[PDB]
Amino acid sequence: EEPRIGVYVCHCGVNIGGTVDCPDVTEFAKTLKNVVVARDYKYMCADPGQEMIKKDIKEHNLNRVVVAACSPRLHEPTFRRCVAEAGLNPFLFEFANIREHCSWVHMHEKEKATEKAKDLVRMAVAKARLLEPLEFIKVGVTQRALVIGGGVAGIQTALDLGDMGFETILVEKTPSVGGRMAQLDKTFPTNDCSICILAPKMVDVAKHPNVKLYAYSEVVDVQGYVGNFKVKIMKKARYIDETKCTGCGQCSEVCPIDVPNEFDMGIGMRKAIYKPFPQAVPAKYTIDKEHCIECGLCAKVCGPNAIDFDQEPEIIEAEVGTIICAIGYDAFDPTVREEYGYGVYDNVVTALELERMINASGPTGGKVIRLSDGQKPKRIAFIQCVGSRDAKVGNKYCSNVCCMYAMKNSQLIKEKSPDTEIDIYYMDIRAFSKGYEEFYERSAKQYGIKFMRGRPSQVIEDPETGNLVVRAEDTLLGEILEKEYDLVVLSVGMVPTKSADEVQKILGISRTPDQFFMEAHPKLRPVDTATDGVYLAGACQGPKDIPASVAQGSAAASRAAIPLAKGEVEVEPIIASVDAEICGGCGVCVKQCPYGAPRLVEKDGKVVAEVISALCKGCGTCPAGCPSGALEQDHFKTIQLFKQIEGMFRDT
Amino acid sequence: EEPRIGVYVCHCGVNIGGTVDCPDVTEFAKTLKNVVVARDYKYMCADPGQEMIKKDIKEHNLNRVVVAACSPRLHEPTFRRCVAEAGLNPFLFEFANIREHCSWVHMHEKEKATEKAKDLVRMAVAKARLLEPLEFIKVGVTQRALVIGGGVAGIQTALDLGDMGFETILVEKTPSVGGRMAQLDKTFPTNDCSICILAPKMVDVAKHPNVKLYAYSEVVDVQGYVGNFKVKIMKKARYIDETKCTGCGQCSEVCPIDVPNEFDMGIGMRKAIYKPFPQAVPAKYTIDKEHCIECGLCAKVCGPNAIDFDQEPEIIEAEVGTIICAIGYDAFDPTVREEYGYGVYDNVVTALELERMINASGPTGGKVIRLSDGQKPKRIAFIQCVGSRDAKVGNKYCSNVCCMYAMKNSQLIKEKSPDTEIDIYYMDIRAFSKGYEEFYERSAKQYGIKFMRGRPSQVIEDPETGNLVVRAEDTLLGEILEKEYDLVVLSVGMVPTKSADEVQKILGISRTPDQFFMEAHPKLRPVDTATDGVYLAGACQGPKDIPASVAQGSAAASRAAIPLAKGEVEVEPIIASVDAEICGGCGVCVKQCPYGAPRLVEKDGKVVAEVISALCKGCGTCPAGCPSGALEQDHFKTIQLFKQIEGMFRDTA
């Protein structure tokens, strides 16, 4: 049959129509070959727009639909379901992006943006003519979930999934689950003991019948697609027998290597054999082989002889149907802002070091003391927006929690020492959620905490005393302040965690300008990714507090449970296939695929290539490299792209 | 069996031990009858502390545990599981609070704090002796959910549940789903149209095979408990057979009367025969009798014959296992702030009115106009924190979104009219989520929007020209500014929706100080309530933007799916029951229970009261009111409370 195309140009209210002359684009679209219907409407995705398309598909017997509107990364599934409801195969639909790619980037050149939209419509119509009916591929969904990261956000997702009756694997890289919440002393705005409320969750997840917890483990390989993932988990060697070891810790004394205790942000030293923190789950000790000198003194003191250096990492192969990434975040390193003196002055600390100093289980026994002389500081200055809202360090975002945690620990210091003077140097106080503004008022009226509106310009150490002078304009007075402090705390912001690069490559997910992981859309799908069957939860998706991470944890559990409950999803048939009559068995294509889908086989008494449809993801590399042209990926054939290139310059 | 009690005093580092002499409390506890083991430990809720209790339960054969530490509101579930692991029934454990209620409030009176802790331990032991082993009551869960409110939050909850395979009811008060997002033009920080994100969801929800949508309907009664709710829905009468209705809109043209259109916040005027907004779902029309005149004019032009004045509201009865409240919010009414002149000055408008003005599908065709001149204002002032962060109006909270939506609509005005000068009067710019700070930088750098740090003191109308003058200090200059504007927009804050009182009364849930609905825990249960089987989602739980409301909708669906997926839950047995041999059916209790649990029955010829265990929530009002003592609430018996009162003054020996 000859193509009968319907072209629909959206205004997106004014987001498109304000820049692109949408009526003039629809008029141009009618002059194109095979276009029988062309309309422009304010919202194509709204109910009147979808009913319009479907009514045209039936009344005009359309076999192709072109929508010139937003990105297909937003609404391609939406319109594929729309046209499929009217009978039209979902892959006779072509998307033209005239918003993100045109109207929003050419606002000052309306005439050229309109001409450009016409070209983009024509390139779409060109490819549309050669599109073919494809069948969505139904695949079974493995009734198991994987959660990477055992913080409050990942714990919440596993408990929710486990409580629904889904088998769930929880992989935690460090020896213990708990995340940074396990490092906090208290939590604003209620000042609940952080570990005391979280520990019952850590207990629950270790004891849960439907949750397998792999602590001191990391995901090292992910293969397959939604509902059909095959993952490798490396259970790293503690070099201690989980079964034969107490957790008493009488081998550290017999260790000559002192190692930066990362749980305490390096303020206190830990031994080569260690337990991260007392409330750790699982409560089993570990040996850091990186700093281990293998002198064996611990093994002589060890009674059970649980110590075995021969211990090897064990790889777990497991099939899951959905994956939730919840690997958290790290604290910004404020060394780059040299005028503040971190790493140079003894008495400049980050706020997350402060959390460990204030915490009773912390290295200092909960006592805030200067790192130069060990005395208690009587004057303390907080500096806000350190590493955030700062183009000089590349972090132009707001870290969301630093305003609240700076007032929090100012309250906790006042409670342990009422006569401490505390000044907070801020730009905006962002106390934006339920009880936050009240917490902000409380900090000033009840705890007498001072607020200076003025980002400090530099910190100057008195080399005699070790004290610090903070210099800032009191912008609410128009005068330059130069107050002296005994301790300066840098309210450092949040950055992605160190391993976010490794995880990103394994899962195949993107990143937003803030370097955190990219949701499919901030409002349509706040915890989905554009990778089907992969979801986000918590601070790894962006800076946020505990209730926000927990909500995302539960949200990601709901979203990840949909394919598991359905038991069956559909994947795109944009796969490569070999034409046996043209393939001469050259061998070029088999090494090109990273999943080994193309293979050399003998057919009809001769050698041809053949691709296992199940191993092909649809990248299209091997068809592009095929010398004979026997390889082709559907929906992206060379002839279809050829017509699209012609469509820019001329109709066909 | 004679009580064998273990008493555990906790130091909580020095939180308790610094003020209360715990070793002294411990020694005193061993003087009380039935105390077999007593010890102080630094962290009782820590694993070594729990292992110390469970291990004593077995070695010393204890049948009661007292822990003097923090509040039961924190660790009561913690220690109940601890003792259950050791074979001891969880209701033979009693919590004494010596931190929140003693050491932390008597820091300067240590001697008296120690003596107080001793009385609090003795009162705990005293009740502990008479505690009884109880069993959790298992109940089935109806495999269906109910969502109340069809904004982004409620829609998201229904689609997630429906997609999981659970039958779901979605009740929407207005003729159309969509909520306040439907009223917005664009949405920060992507500046999509609201229709971009919402309308496909509205479409999906209406045709979902597992979602029954009851638009123009309201819940009017809810009875029962988790997994066993019996709800009554009043499906209001549209006076148009929806099955026959086409939504073409031919009828609206003929209508001879006009009506203030609430969807446009009293700006645009509609017919009594109407559909809220052009993209409304269901795409059906509604007749409002408050103004209908019944001349048949609408029916004459309608082909289908859907119009029908004989319609009567229908009441639907449905079993559900879980309920999600997502009834949204209302804009603050800034009339009470007299200094700004809303309701007095023509050209003072709220921000939600501005959204209806700027929206392409709006009564003004997307044209920002002065409501006095009809002209386009070339100078516009935004005033932040209207009705928020203000003790004079009883709203001491931050409404979360007003900073961003003010910068949003400023960008959109600048796009439609670059010549417009826009000044935002603010205290703090709260651009706190992903891309927000960048949105904030973009508003100033790219769109040349101006920010004045200074909360305006008053708005002075020019009666002659309708122009407005805004008096405020430029706090960043130390000078008083008096600039003139063609239009002033009040960035009003969020407040609970008018019908929130009705919904609260029906579902029996609490409210936070800000008057929004109270979550079960402010940190770890953001979408649960203290009422089992009832959950929250969206702005009715507190001021928040669309991404947060959508994430809560998906979070509430996960939480509300746990009982549905389990098909069974447990209810606490701290319930009331009748001793048939003591009750002579006086009838005092029946009317005391707001859930109708106690009932008069006839067994063995006589009348006797009887409590339906499933209907009892454990308040204990009617046992306190029973004159014969036949009625007792397990775990709070009169005799148990009597012992506790004596324990304040003497050992129960």
Ligand SMILES: Cc1cc2nc3c(=O)[nH]c(=O)nc-3n(C[C@H](O)[C@H](O)[C@H](O)COP(=O)(O)OP(=O)(O)OC[C@H]3O[C@@H](n4cnc5c(N)ncnc54)[C@H](O)[C@@H]3O)c2cc1C
């Ligand atoms: C100084 C400071 C004070 C704060 N105060 C508060 C407060 O008072 N109240 C509040 O609500 N919020 C506060 N926050 C924010 C709070 O810490 C976060 O909201 C919270 O930690 C988010 O939990 P999460 O699980 O999403 O991330 P995380 O807590 O960081 O947990 C992520 C987990 O994943 C693990 N992980 C990381 N990489 C991998 C990998 N490759 N494989 C497997 N596992 C991995 C990590 O070990 C960690 O256990 C504060 C933050 C800071 C910096």
Ligand SMILES: Cc1cc2nc3c(=O)[nH]c(=O)nc-3n(C[C@H](O)[C@H](O)[C@H](O)COP(=O)(O)OP(=O)(O)OC[C@H]3O[C@@H](n4cnc5c(N)ncnc54)[C@H](O)[C@@H]3O)c2cc1C
């Ligand atoms: C001027 C303004 C601009 C804004 N701009 C933005 C923006 O740009 N970006 C952004 O993300 N957010 C913005 N917001 C916030 C946004 O409006 C909310 O986050 C969002 O509307 C919350 O959705 P919701 O479903 O929770 O509540 P709602 O949107 O209010 O929906 C509640 C629904 O429940 C229904 N309902 C109410 N009572 C009952 C009852 N008794 N029975 C049954 N149903 C009932 C209502 O009819 C309504 O459909 C803005 C808010 C305002 C005021």
Ligand code: SF4
């Ligand atoms: S979304 Fe894509 S489609 Fe729905 S409106 Fe904005 S643009 Fe037109």
Ligand code: SF4
């Ligand atoms: S010492 Fe031997 S035993 Fe005591 S802990 Fe270290 S390992 Fe387990």
Ligand code: SF4
């Ligand atoms: S061996 Fe490696 S670890 Fe065991 S002690 Fe000597 S050092 Fe510390």
Ligand code: SF4
């Ligand atoms: S939060 Fe308060 S501090 Fe942390 S960034 Fe946004 S503003 Fe600067």
Ligand code: SF4
């Ligand atoms: S390359 Fe083209 S031709 Fe050479 S084998 Fe793979 S397919 Fe057959």
Ligand code: SF4
């Ligand atoms: S296409 Fe990309 S993926 Fe499908 S096979 Fe050839 S290579 Fe492996």
Ligand code: SF4
């Ligand atoms: S128990 Fe309540 S009090 Fe005793 S420690 Fe754990 S928390 Fe601090």
Ligand code: SF4
């Ligand atoms: S006319 Fe009869 S049908 Fe056409 S809309 Fe008004 S009502 Fe629905």
Ligand code: SF4
């Ligand atoms: S009848 Fe009621 S509704 Fe139908 S037209 Fe006359 S008025 Fe408008």
Ligand code: SF4
């Ligand atoms: S949001 Fe910006 S505006 Fe709305 S209140 Fe909190 S601060 Fe005042």
Ligand code: SF4
């Ligand atoms: S009140 Fe006490 S006594 Fe009178 S009936 Fe209800 S129960 Fe039997």
Ligand code: SF4
């Ligand atoms: S206790 Fe409160 S609830 Fe349980 S019955 Fe007596 S009254 Fe009704």
Ligand SMILES: [Fe+3]
């Ligand atoms: Fe505790």
